[PDB]
Amino acid sequence: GIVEQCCTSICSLYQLENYCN
Amino acid sequence: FVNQHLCGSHLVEALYLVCGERGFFYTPKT
């Protein structure tokens, strides 16, 4: 996901938030 | 800070800026 949401598109800080803790 | 694509090198820098001191774990590959 995070690998295909930002490189393969535009992901935000809340979308990337699913990887913090 | 800008809505755009963050390929791993950008992600590691957008995921740390967004959640660095908190640490994380992103390594998906589908």
DSSP B22: T
* Full DSSP string of A1-21: -HHHHTTTS-B-TTTGGGG--
Method: NMR
The pair of structure tokens assigned to B10 is: 């950008």
Q: Which of A7, A8, A17 sits opposite B19 (nearest CB)?
A: A17
Q: How far apart are CA A15 and CA A8, in angstroms?
A: 14
Q: φ and ψ at A7, to 5 degrees?
A: -65, -50
Q: Could you tell me if B11 lies within 8 Å of chain A, comparing CB atoms?
A: yes
Structural domain total, chain B: 1
Nearest to B11 by CA among A18, A11, A21: A11
DSSP B14: H
Minimal Cα–Cα distance from B13 to chain A, Å?
11
**Which 3 state secondary structure label does DSSP give B5?**
coil
Q: How far apart are CA A4 and CA B5, in angstroms?
A: 9
Query: The domain containing residue B9 runs over which residues?
Result: 1-30
Length of chain B: 30
CB distance A21 to B24 below 8 Å: yes
Q: Do B14 and A20 touch (CB under 8 A)?
A: no
